[PDB]
DNA sequence: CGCGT
DNA sequence: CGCGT
């Protein structure tokens, strides 16, 4: 049994002692060449159909010798074309034979899933009748003839008959629906054992047939076999049996077995008896027979196992990120873009902490890469880990090096030097190559080298030239592959391709918003919570400066906080102003306005309505723009908000799908919207709360939500002091990370309670909302926090004076979060 | 040379004598055998390129015989599958043996366009190394290999050698790039030229290599050749010519020929010159290299003729309706569906015709018509002249029956005999056969048979049992197909998928539009003339019942027209009332308001569009449904229209998609249109003439303009006349047909004029168009006529008092014809 | 009631 | 001016 060898970051598999070169190959014998043919394809077509690796074959020469003419054919039947260059490859070194092979398909989702197999196999044990002769289907041939079978005679003349006499000759030939076998009675019971599982099979896989056992081919004479030596109750049971053992694969119901007609008949000479004769009628099956188990072989645990012919045949007809496969590209130019002329370090925030920590490391990184001049070297604390493997203390960094003229190599780096550090090199970069082809689908050629270097101051495979990453082209299929792998798991860049993915799914969103511009002037837009509705405004308020020609003090946006409105003037899109200010200052020189969070202005201070449209309205391009943002679900107060009556906000658009959340925190927010719906507030218009989201979205988009109760002040302000301190130790940094209290008065409470517990995290420094460029950690309320998100919030005792606030809090609170979210509700 | 018979309604090649059966085959010579069975595999193939056939052989032997394992054996590689069952059939009839060849790939767009070649051949005469061997590639393999070269060593060690010794041991083998060719002095003038085509072409497409010629394969030994024999200079001049004559196609450019590099050694023994050794670089090739021309045949007119190179790699690598393709099973069901239980004939109003003209022509059809009681059974007047042929006097009609358990028999009826009847049946049921396999794309077996009928009171080749139309998959997937080929010539049956495809347009264009319902309440949309605005508006007031669930009684449709507003009314769909009428009566009850027409309104009786707010705004649904249907292209007057000024009319829709008109008449609209841009009417607003229909959009759907100048009266109304008689003729009804004049009060002067010379044509009724229901031509005004439209139009003399208005009378003119239109303007 | 005052 | 009157 071939087993892979594990010292290798590669699937190398060792066939033992392999005669090469077809000068030798010949003079062996017959079964010593099949054996080791035999061998040698079992290796190729496991690693064919196990992401790919290389075979290694200890030849009994020095000198260079060729493959030979049977292995060539047998590699090029297995891959089905002479195209052999793409797949194999080989090496030799003194007496040791190397065969680099490629995976056959990789990826979950490959470009060719409906048109070629995803299994290559030695055969495939399916025959069929192709007019007067028995063929095997290959696996394309196979391939099609599963997926057929998936979807939802004057022979019959001679069969009828009850005896035949002694050289009849028959009027049919052997076609497409007649086989006539010769039966001898030396081995008569063997002969018809064997014969079976040939032509019952390739009878039952096309359109049925007859077999006539015991008539000359040549001259169609019956003939029979001797009548002392054939028991005719005997012999049918061998022949159902045989039948009936055939193995046979169904796509439907029911699942009878295979049917056919089994009569037996004396052959007669001058009136007397002389023998017995065979003839099968096999009416054609449903579905796929099989003669027996395919061959093909796969690569579980470090054996090579074979496929059964349940497994052969469901792969044959049959965390992924859907996402992150459709934005491959853009999500790649984003974080991994291939810089022309030196040598790109990422994540930058992270290799200026791993340098200042521990000295050294910078020249020790400089140093080793010297001989490379462009590429990108991708830094982590532990790529193990990334890839849910265990860490290993005592590492400092790995860093996956992505160079051109090179193959991808795995650096980690070691404080001392150990035994097990090569080990762990070893492990992680074999499963970062198989993550690349069975998660990222590359479907080139791949090989990571492991790589370990010590920071306190078995032999590397030689793979062909062609492993090496010729240029951009090579480099950049190979970064989207891995951004594709990187989106499978917890990670820093995972959640930095993450983010990226959200802010792509809101492009998308926005296109299509962004139509109505030209249709409406007057707009009353009620998005969803995660909808996007803020981001859609600040694209808004470009295109009205874009399409309108107007400068940016034309145009007016009014919320109701304060750092919202700092957060829109820093981007000097437009005017920002608060309602306090829109009904106070005067506003004649403005065109357009544009409104947000409308559902939380109130009526106290004055008719922002009515002093909002005389503005508009009088405005030199006659009505103009007045857009109205507002979300009923995050309706934090009970007072009136000053909108015209539900009837009255025409025209209206509306923002249903969730493109701002992760896929924990959207869920959640659904399952909250729904409790509003059944107990809306009593302010709220009654036909605002049946607005319902997309039938059926989803972001591919993974994030973290959690919910701890019930814990005293100290220990919710420990767990939020030691889980900033774990994200920041990844590399996160600290401008993602927000702390929401419920009121603004009990900020300061909790702002001395948090330096108090997290200055021994090394950090004693804080901001609040209206602040939103210094890199700290802000703490602010709820309320005030509208408007802006973070990547990571934590919620601390979510409170209001009316229950019937209460859901629209949590909403409020946790749409806010795009991927992580901790709540410590009151207990 | 084969050439195809003619006496058939399909492809016959008679391909002679040709031995059949294994035993008879192995018995002949090499070259008998190998004669024969290139022959038969020319007319395979012949018949493979070309929508299928029958292959015909005559045998020299009465009983049946099997076709023989080489027939097989190249039939499969030249159909590369097992699957022979599925294109070819054989069946045998005394000493004739017939093989029923169906077509590779069918279609000119078919479903596998990308994945599997467009042609079937013997050899594609491509070569390439394939490690220690050189192996062709079939048509697959070289398929993917012309797509990729489309898309945008030690052994050198031995190469700059000037001479080498006799008996030295080269150390590398042969490879990928090394080739060693023992050169003998008795042929080595013709052992070089034979070789270079084999190898030079194998090592030019695929990297490249080295030839070495004087060099032993198993002992990697230098001998040489004779030196008394070859001539250095000679012997480069046959080596250089030998691969300067290879064929090459390339896909780039430049286009520079083949690179190599011929170095010519001395081989030296004991230090004394032996002989002369030939190494040959052989750079790697921009494009494809062929050893010789492509082995691929095609049928062209009665020859079988091969594809030369250029035109079997164009071919390889690469009227047809787009709009007929993807709504052809949307198209069938409308027309051609499949009664079950009954035959149905089609079309019913022309076959209504023909039985009345014809005395017993309804028995004669339906005795014909018993065997079979299920399908349908197409009629036409001559089915020669539909797809393009030339029309037999003599022949009644033509009937094509599409029955279950039935090959498609061609019908054609005269009403006396005559020799000529059964040649145009096959040619027309040839024709058709070709069109549904290279036209419409049938992929399945068809076969179309040729039958002619007498009304006054060569054998027909027998298809296998996999000819006939099983059952409803069948003949709907060969309906499908007949509907595609239908849309590309001008016929009757043509002419109603053609309208039917305008119908299909529009509904998508209306599940588009028909989301603004939920989103505006009043709503401005501005159509272009043609884009469906009156089909949208009664599909929206149907859309208000459903929604709102208001009674009809409760919508209000107002237009300016009378004939409009009787349309409206007869479908039932609401209340439809003219302008003045709304004006007059009291309409308290009225919950929804729909306008169309609107630029055409005028003030002369009051304001209305202040009296539509009214009506709406007091709704019970607060501001309920006011949407003003209107295009400013077609402003028929000079008036105020009472609408309110551009830039109140907001919300607004858009419709520039022209979906209601075919090609020639769309095509007419947007060069009108384009005229008004230029010079607006002073009463349009200024931004109103500046919305441009989609970017590029074509319907698909094929119809004709005509116009005609300078004719007077008497020989307009006779061009009227004669013209509807032969759309009659054809079985085009009358109510397909509307007359169209400037003026009312120009009616009555023209109606007389019709009727005077129509009356020839047994014809002397007409309608006006607030009658169109009655099956009578529509003669009215051009005005009078807005909202309404007709299948065929004739404009005469399109006149208005102000030239400014001028170009809006032919737009509102041109729109009113679906298909045809024919104008006789002023002179 | 909460936040901008 | 044109059509519904
Ligand atoms: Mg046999
Ligand atoms: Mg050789
Ligand atoms: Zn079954
Ligand atoms: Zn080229």
Same mark, same amino acid.
């Given at each position: 049994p071939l087993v892979v060898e594990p010292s290798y970051p590669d699937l190398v598999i060792n066939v033992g002692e392999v005669t090469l070169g077809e000068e030798n190959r010949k003079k062996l014998q017959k079964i010593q060449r099949d054996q080791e043919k035999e061998r040698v394809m079992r290796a190729a077509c496991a690693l064919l159909n196990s992401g790919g690796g290389v075979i290694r074959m200890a030849k009994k020469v020095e000198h260079p010798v060729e493959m030979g003419l049977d292995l060539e054919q047998s590699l090029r039947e297995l891959i089905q074309?002479? @195209? $052999?260059?793409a797949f194999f490859e080989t090496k030799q070194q003194g007496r040791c034979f190397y065969i680099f092979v490629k995976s056959w398909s990789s990826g979950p989702?490959?470009? @060719?899933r409906s048109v070629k197999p995803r299994l290559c196999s030695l055969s495939s044990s399916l025959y069929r009748r192709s007019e007067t002769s028995v063929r095997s289907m290959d696996s394309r041939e196979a391939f099609c003839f599963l997926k057929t079978k998936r979807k939802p005679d004057p022979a019959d003349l001679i069969f009828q008959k009850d005896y035949l006499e002694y050289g009849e000759i028959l009027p049919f030939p052997e076609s497409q629906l007649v086989e006539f076998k010769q039966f001898s009675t030396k081995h008569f019971q063997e002969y018809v054992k064997r014969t079976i599982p040939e032509y019952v099979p390739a009878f039952a896989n096309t359109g049925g047939g007859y077999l006539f056992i015991g008539? %000359?081919?040549?001259?169609?004479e019956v003939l029979g076999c001797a009548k002392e030596n054939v028991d005719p109750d005997s012999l049918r049971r061998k022949i159902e049996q045989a039948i009936y053992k055939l193995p046979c694969v169904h796509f439907?119901?029911?699942?009878?077995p295979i049917t056919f007609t089994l009569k037996i008949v004396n052959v007669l000479k001058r009136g007397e008896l002389y023998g017995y004769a065979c003839m099968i009628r096999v009416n054609p099956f449903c579905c796929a027979v099989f003669?027996?188990?395919?061959?093909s072989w796969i690569v579980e645990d470090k054996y090579v196992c074979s496929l059964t012919t349940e497994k052969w045949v469901g792969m044959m007809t049959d965390v992924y990120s859907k996402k992150g496969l459709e934005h491959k590209k853009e999500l790649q130019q984003l974080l991994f873009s291939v810089p022309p002329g030196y040598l790109r370090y990422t994540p930058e925030s992270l290799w200026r902490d791993l340098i200042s920590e521990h000295r050294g490391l910078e020249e020790l990184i400089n140093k080793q890469m010297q001989?490379?001049?462009r590429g990108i070297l991708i830094f982590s604390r532990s790529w193990a880990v990334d890839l849910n493997l265990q860490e290993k203390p005592g590492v400092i960094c790995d860093a996956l090096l992505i160079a051109q003229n090179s193959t991808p190599i795995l650096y980690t780096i070691l404080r001392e030097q150990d035994a097990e550090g090569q080990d762990y090199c070893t492990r992680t970069a074999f499963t970062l190559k198989q993550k690349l082809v069975?998660?990222?689908?590359?479907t080139g050629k791949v090989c990571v080298r492991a790589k370990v270097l010590c920071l306190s101051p078995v032999s590397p495979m030689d793979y062909p030239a062609?492993?090496?990453?010729?240029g951009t082209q090579h480099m950049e299929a190979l970064l989207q592959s891995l951004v594709i792998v990187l989106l499978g798991f917890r990670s820093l860049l995972s959640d930095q391709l993450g983010c990226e993915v959200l802010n792509l799914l809101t492009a998308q969103q926005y296109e299509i918003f962004s139509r109505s511009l030209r249709k409406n002037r007057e707009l009353f837009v009620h998005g969803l919570p995660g909808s996007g509705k803020t981001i859609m405004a600040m694209k808004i308020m470009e295109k009205i400066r874009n399409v309108?020609?107007?400068?940016?003090?034309r145009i007016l946006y009014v919320c109701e906080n304060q750092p919202l409105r700092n957060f829109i003037s820093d981007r000097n899109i437009c005017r920002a102003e608060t309602r306090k200010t829109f009904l106070r200052?005067?506003?004649?020189?403005?065109?357009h306005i544009v409104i947000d969070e409308?559902?939380?202005?109130?009526?106290e201070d004055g008719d922002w309505y009515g002093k909002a449209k005389s503005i508009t309205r009088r405005a030199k391009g006659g009505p103009g723009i007045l857009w109205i943002f507002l979300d009923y679900?995050?309706?934090?107060? $009970? @007072?009136?908000?000053?909108?015209?009556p539900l009837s009255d906000q025409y025209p209206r658009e509306e $923002?249903?799908?969730?493109?701002?959340?992760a896929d924990p925190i959207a869920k959640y927010l659904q399952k909250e919207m729904q409790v509003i719906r059944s107990n809306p507030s009593?302010?709220?218009?009654?036909?605002? $709360?049946?607005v319902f989201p997309e039938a059926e979205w989803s972001q591919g988009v993974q994030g973290t939500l959690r919910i701890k109760k019930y814990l005293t002040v100290e220990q919710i302000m420990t767990c939020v002091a030691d889980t900033c301190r774990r994200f920041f130790d990844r590399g996160?940094?600290?401008?993602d990370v927000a702390v929401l209290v419920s009121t603004a008065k009990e900020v300061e409470h909790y702002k001395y309670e948090l330096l108090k517990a997290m200055r021994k995290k090394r950090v004693v420094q804080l901001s609040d909302a209206?602040?939103?460029?210094? @890199?700290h950690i802000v703490l602010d309320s709820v309320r005030r926090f509208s408007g802006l998100e973070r990547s990571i919030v934590f919620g601390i005792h979510?409170?209001?004076? %009316?229950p019937a606030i209460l859901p629209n809090v949590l909403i409020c609170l946790a749409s806010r979060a795009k991927q992580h979210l901790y709540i410590f509700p009151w207990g």
């Open positions: 074309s002479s @195209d $052999l260059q989702f490959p470009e @060719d008539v %000359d081919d040549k001259s169609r439907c119901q029911p699942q009878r003669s027996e188990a395919p061959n001989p490379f001049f069975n998660m990222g689908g590359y062609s492993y090496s990453l010729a309108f020609h107007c400068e940016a003090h200052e005067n506003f004649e020189h403005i065109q409308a559902q939380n202005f109130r009526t679900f995050q309706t934090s107060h $009970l @007072d009136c908000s000053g909108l015209p $923002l249903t799908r969730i493109v701002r959340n009593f302010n709220i218009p009654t036909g605002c $709360l049946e996160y940094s600290p401008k209206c602040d939103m460029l210094g @890199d979510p409170r209001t004076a %009316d």
